[PDB]
Design a protein around this nucleic acid. Structure first.
Ligand SMILES: [K+]
Ligand SMILES: [K+]
Ligand SMILES: [K+]
Ligand SMILES: [K+]
Ligand SMILES: [Mg+2]
Ligand SMILES: [Mg+2]
Ligand SMILES: [Mg+2]
Ligand SMILES: [Mg+2]
Ligand SMILES: [Mg+2]
Ligand SMILES: [Mg+2]
Ligand SMILES: [Mg+2]
Ligand SMILES: [Mg+2]
Ligand SMILES: [Mg+2]
Ligand SMILES: [Mg+2]
Ligand SMILES: [Mg+2]
Ligand SMILES: [Mg+2]
Ligand SMILES: [Mg+2]
Ligand SMILES: [Mg+2]
Ligand SMILES: [Mg+2]
Ligand SMILES: [Mg+2]
Ligand SMILES: [Mg+2]
Ligand SMILES: [Mg+2]
Ligand SMILES: [Mg+2]
Ligand SMILES: [Mg+2]
Ligand SMILES: [Mg+2]
Ligand SMILES: [Mg+2]
Ligand SMILES: [Mg+2]
Ligand SMILES: [Mg+2]
Ligand SMILES: [Mg+2]
Ligand SMILES: [Mg+2]
Ligand SMILES: [Mg+2]
Ligand SMILES: [Mg+2]
Ligand SMILES: [Mg+2]
Ligand SMILES: [Mg+2]
Ligand SMILES: [Mg+2]
Ligand code: NA
Ligand code: NA
Ligand code: NA
Ligand code: NA
Ligand code: NA
Ligand SMILES: [Zn+2]
Lengths: 97, 39, 93, 248, 50, 49, 76, 70
RNA sequence: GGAGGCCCGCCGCGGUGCUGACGCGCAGAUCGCUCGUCGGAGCCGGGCAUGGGGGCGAAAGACUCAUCGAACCGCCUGGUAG
RNA sequence: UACUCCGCGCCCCGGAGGACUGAGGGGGAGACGGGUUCCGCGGCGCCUGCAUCUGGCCGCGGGUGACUCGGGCCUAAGCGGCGGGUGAAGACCGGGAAGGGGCGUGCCCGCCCGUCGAACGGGGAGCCGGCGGAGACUCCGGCAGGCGCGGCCCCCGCGGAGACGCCCGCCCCCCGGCGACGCGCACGGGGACCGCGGCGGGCGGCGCCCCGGCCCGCGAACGCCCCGCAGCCCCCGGACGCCUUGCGCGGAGAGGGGGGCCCGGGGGCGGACCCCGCGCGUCCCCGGCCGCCCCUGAAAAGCCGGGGGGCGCCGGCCGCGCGCCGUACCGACCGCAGCAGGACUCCGGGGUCAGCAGCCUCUAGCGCGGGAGCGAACGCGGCUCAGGGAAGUCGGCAAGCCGGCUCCGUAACCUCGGGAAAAGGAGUGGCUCUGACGGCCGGGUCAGAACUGGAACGGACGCGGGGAUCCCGACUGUUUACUAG
């Protein structure tokens, strides 16, 4: 068609960060609008601010219990590097102390 | 390519509404008081 | 100095504020844009984050320092005085 | 006439401090039994920027001594303090930069900051960026100690008042020109509504005692007495002298 | 507007139901001289304030 | 720049020049010494011989 | 909608979990004279494409009277 | 009437204070039949309108005729 | 390489000159050309706060719903008048 | 900017012709405000500043459907309440006050407000096709999601060298995370749009040419499997190397080889019996960097993890359920009016071009306080003018000159940054050619030559006149809405 202009899909037309769309062609040769949802951040380390490996960027409510866990004693709260320091620090301190 | 007629064109707010005690269009929607009956 | 004779980084101001202000800004801005040696790892990776906040791009250690420069002379004098007064007390308990 | 600018400021309204997005009130740790006998250990967690303030603030975590868990404080950072450092407070704290201890145990000639005028008030004396106090002398008979304030005046305080070793971080801030009117605008937009400033001689008589006339000028002397009533106290209040003397 | 409370909607509903003429059998049953209802309104001329 | 760098990388990864020569030519390319691919190619033969 | 394998087709039909079975004969393009088996389940619609028409008769005859069956065989 | 013939649905006027569950119960008790779903609506003149769709094994047309609507 | 209360310039935001048109007007302040600015002490929408001898003012006695060198409404009040 | 012929009447409807708005729309939709103006049938008494068979006018009947869209919940700036305090009262002010729950009947825990305030902020979950005269993310058909409740079966952890993987426990105390956040020139990726070539289907015109013109060729949410650059991490081992447009990194462990994690995305198969290739640009979103600040760029509900303690099927299949309110239409809103004013936001094709500028146009919409004749003065808005060139006038006011791009050449003075497009010169069309720059065919740009047109080429459009001085204010900025910028 010679015109590809669309109309707003939301209750109002103000374009905030939760009102973003993309365009796709439908089976009836029509151009439609689809929401672009915000992607949440995955959990971040407590000691450092880096991201924790093994967990996807989805809200935890939509994940199974196994998919939001890491198999380590402090898994999901701190990284492997930060856990070594705590183990070394506690042992070396309690040996001298 | 004023303070009169052109400024009347910027009016699209409701200052008063209907009172629940007297029902008289004198309830201030931002003070939450009636200018007529005092509710 | 292929492009300017004397203005240096104060060339962003054109001709707009006078000579005294531009000279003082030259000194201060040169100081505040510089890279400083990290006191914890001896590398020149410390940069300013806010008025008195300095961060290392290697070890990621944050320090409280001066504005425009990591160290100030009054602070060095004070640290030396504290260190001296600390030893005299610990000899006699 | 009508009410002057000074009279309108005191009633609040558009003259209140903008406090949105501020970390909180900076204070020394509260005084308790544990540090009235020994020392309490803490760890510096972060160094942050406070809106409106020129000096940085440090977040320090201490153990909880009346239960379980931890307690988060908010200090004014001395120069040289770094993230991950551990500090002590109490009668037995050691003489290091970040530590808090009573002034009676601090040797004469030391630099201190965030001093408290009266015991257990949590700091009030040297809190602006670059400032510091000096311990001058002790008097064991009366249990009072003399300090020197950043303004140069000398004061006596009780020997049980606490302070922090070092000087406040961020020194040198006022050595750089603001240069532009837009910079002063941002600086004062972080604090309160007080800028820009209109001169009194440029007003009409109805809204300032200095206004009016066929030339811009102050009619009378600008020195007003100490007992002038609120709408009169403009100019130089109870001035001992005027002008650029040049000597000490 | 298209986003109203039920309370405003109910007061505007009564205004519409009342904008009617005098029925023909009423005019002659009561022997009426004035045959128009002067409490009617027109949307282009009125301010209901409701 | 992208053309020159991909050529140099392909030559290093074939062991057609030593890593030291590779670094020197990398710097000379970043210095605006070569105007096109042809001029770089004949320079490499000279340096190699 | 999801694809299903042959072995767990008549198994599902064994546990009485299918609600209907449709047979459609595809004879154009990459679907060259093959047939698609579509089984309606409580949660999903499952479809299998047997590689040849003959395989369809055996399986469907292997579940005859166990689940109701439709035929399409569009020839247009 | 097209609704009755096509979608197995009847359109009724109810009291504004009624909610969907009680309209469903009242329809089931007053006309002995089964109800599948109810949609409601408040009209510009202030009345409440209900769209009542009967259960698949119920012919809406015969109930409509019996009540006299047909 | 890409800084700047930098420059030319569109929409916007303003309002220089013609002392142009109009001046029983399209209009109780508008129209046309020409013009100023256009990454910033920028511009716009909604919510909220400040009330009359009071407010608010980068200051013109400006603005505070066509009203401001002291708003509007009712009453004292059929105020007094050589 | 604008109508005409015929049916039929300058204004309604139809066909044919001729035009316009010109993607910041006289287009298609929302917020606020309006409140039935919406739809069908009939009509011309009023209004539709001319007419009317027309109508937002008059009469009679109709019309707004939600587990998934918004409100109802959260908290912002704020507002209210609070044993009490004060004031002749009305009222106003307010942390120092024996201020609640759980499990289940006895015990245990616990200093102290708000189901107030955002139809743009936060928030658990929806797509396609079709149907009416007026409604649709709401109806019907299909295919899915989320959150609960009830039955039946129904389990208290293994793999890896490691990063981590794979098949799903709850309650309390504490420690955390997500929600959750600035601006910017560039660079890279994805989507949609756009264009070019090929193949299949349809059409138009044709004095001459024409495989050279026009139109069409569609694939969603969701499920499973593969791939996914940059970033971050693991193993071996032990270094002048790796690498960006720019940078940046390395003994606190680089390069190399082999692996893991995330990635708003893509491919395959389903949904659904998929015409084939290629490319520059535009818009939106995302990514890793770098730069900036005496400016550092919200909160809470809700949800989840870890440690310690105490407890115990917790998942699969099959069934049911999801209350209340908004929902038509409009710049039909405010300015006494159907007033050249004012009035927030979303989607944004082709050509010329640096350009979203100016000019013409496809799609869509549409001819608006009425017409005819004549071609005086005079006015309003425009055009040209011999010779002279500010002699006009308080005053170069008004108008005129200049102007795009490329090359050449640019003074005094200066806070050394400027002045500067200083001043001032020359070229520019069409056609036919030549060279240069990539990749294992694409693309435009830049440079040079011959020929040839009334001594012509930024041929419309768009687009600085310049210089020498004095006074005032340093500069960007603000001001008397309606006579002073
Ligand atoms: K001043
Ligand atoms: K007054
Ligand atoms: K809301
Ligand atoms: K609707
Ligand atoms: Mg995982
Ligand atoms: Mg006024
Ligand atoms: Mg407004
Ligand atoms: Mg004045
Ligand atoms: Mg006075
Ligand atoms: Mg004067
Ligand atoms: Mg910039
Ligand atoms: Mg500028
Ligand atoms: Mg005039
Ligand atoms: Mg006139
Ligand atoms: Mg007051
Ligand atoms: Mg046109
Ligand atoms: Mg609409
Ligand atoms: Mg109509
Ligand atoms: Mg009517
Ligand atoms: Mg929702
Ligand atoms: Mg809802
Ligand atoms: Mg609320
Ligand atoms: Mg929202
Ligand atoms: Mg549904
Ligand atoms: Mg509609
Ligand atoms: Mg609608
Ligand atoms: Mg009015
Ligand atoms: Mg209008
Ligand atoms: Mg003369
Ligand atoms: Mg003369
Ligand atoms: Mg002029
Ligand atoms: Mg000036
Ligand atoms: Mg200016
Ligand atoms: Mg004026
Ligand atoms: Mg003026
Ligand atoms: Na400019
Ligand atoms: Na005056
Ligand atoms: Na009177
Ligand atoms: Na036509
Ligand atoms: Na244009
Ligand atoms: Zn009332």
């Amino acid at each position: 068609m010679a015109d590809c202009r669309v109309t707003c899909r939301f209750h109002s037309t103000y374009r905030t960060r939760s009102k973003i769309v993309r365009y796709k062609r439908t089976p009836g040769n029509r151009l439609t609008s689809l929401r672009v949802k915000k992607l949440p951040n995955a959990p971040h380390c407590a000691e450092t601010g880096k991201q924790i490996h093994g967990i996807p960027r989805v809200i935890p409510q939509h994940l199974t219990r196994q998919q939001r866990k890491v198999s380590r004693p402090y898994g999901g709260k701190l990284c492997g590097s930060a856990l070594r320091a705590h183990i070394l620090e506690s042992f070396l301190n309690e040996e001298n102390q | 390519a004023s303070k009169g007629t052109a400024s009347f064109g910027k009016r699209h707010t409701r200052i008063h509404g209907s009172c629940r005690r007297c029902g008289k269009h004198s309830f201030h929607l931002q003070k939450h008081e009636c200018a007529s009956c005092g509710y | 100095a292929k492009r300017t004779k004397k203005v240096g980084l104060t060339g962003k101001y054109g001709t707009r504020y006078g000579r005294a202000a531009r000279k003082q800004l030259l000194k201060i801005e040169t100081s505040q844009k510089a890279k400083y040696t990290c006191p914890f790892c001896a590398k020149d990776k410390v940069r300013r984050t806010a008025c008195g906040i300095w961060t290392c791009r290697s070890c990621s250690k944050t320090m409280a320092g001066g504005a425009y420069s990591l160290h100030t002379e009054p602070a060095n004098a004070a640290r030396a005085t504290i260190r001296r007064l600390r030893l005299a007390r610990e000899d006699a308990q | 006439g009508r009410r002057i600018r000074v009279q309108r400021k005191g009633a609040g309204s558009v003259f209140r401090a903008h406090v949105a997005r501020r970390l909180g009130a900076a204070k020394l740790r509260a005084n308790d039994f544990a540090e009235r006998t020994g020392s309490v250990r803490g760890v510096v967690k972060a160094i942050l920027h406070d809106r409106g303030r020129g000096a940085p603030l440090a977040r320090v975590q201490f153990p909880n001594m009346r239960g379980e868990g931890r307690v988060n404080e908010l200090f004014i950072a001395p120069e040289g303090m770094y993230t991950g450092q551990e500090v002590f407070s109490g009668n037995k704290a050691t003489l290091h930069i970040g530590n808090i201890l009573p002034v009676g145990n601090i040797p004469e000639g030391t630099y201190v900051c965030n001093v408290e005028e009266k015991p257990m008030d949590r700091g009030c004396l040297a809190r602006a960026s670059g400032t510091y106090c000096l311990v001058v002398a002790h008097n064991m008979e009366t249990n009072k100690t003399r300090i020197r304030l950043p303004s140069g005046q000398k004061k006596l305080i009780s020997s049980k008042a606490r302070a922090m070793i070092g000087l406040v971080a961020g020194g040198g801030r006022t050595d750089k020109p603001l240069l532009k009117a837009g910079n002063a605008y941002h600086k004062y937009k972080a604090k309160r509504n007080c800028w820009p400033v209109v001169r009194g001689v440029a007003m009409n008589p109805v809204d300032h005692p200095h206004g009016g006339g066929n030339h811009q000028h102050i009619g009378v002397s600008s020195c007003v007495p100490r007992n002038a009533v609120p709408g009169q106290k403009v100019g130089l209040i109870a001035a001992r002298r005027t002008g650029c003397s040049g000597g000490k | 507007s298209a986003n109203k409370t039920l309370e405003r909607k109910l007061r505007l509903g009564k205004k519409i139901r009342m904008n009617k003429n005098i029925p023909r059998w009423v005019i002659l049953k009561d022997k009426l001289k004035k045959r128009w209802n002067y409490k009617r309104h027109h949307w282009r001329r009125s301010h209901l304030k409701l | 720049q992208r053309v020159l760098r991909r050529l140099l990388s392909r030559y290093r990864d074939d062991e057609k020049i030593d890593r030291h020569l590779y670094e020197t030519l990398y710097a000379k390319a970043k210095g605006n010494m070569f105007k096109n691919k042809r001029v770089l190619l004949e320079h490499i033969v000279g340096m190699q011989k | 909608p999801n694809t299903i394998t042959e072995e767990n087709l008549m198994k599902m039909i064994a546990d009485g979990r299918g609600k209907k079975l449709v047979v459609k004969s595809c004879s154009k393009g990459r679907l060259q004279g093959k047939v698609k088996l579509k089984l309606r389940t409580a949660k999903y619609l499952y479809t299998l494409t047997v590689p040849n028409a003959d395989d369809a008769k055996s399986i469907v005859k292997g579940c005859k009277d166990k689940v109701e069956v439709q035929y399409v065989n569009d020839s247009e | 009437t097209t609704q009755i013939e096509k979608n197995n649905t009847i359109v009724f006027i109810v009291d504004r204070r009624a909610s969907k569950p009680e309209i469903r119960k009242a329809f089931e008790t007053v006309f002995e039949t089964k109800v599948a779903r109810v949609n409601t609506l408040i009209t510009p003149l202030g009345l409440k309108k209900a769209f009542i769709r009967l259960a698949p094994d119920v012919q809406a047309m015969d109930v409509a005729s019996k009540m006299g609507l047909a």
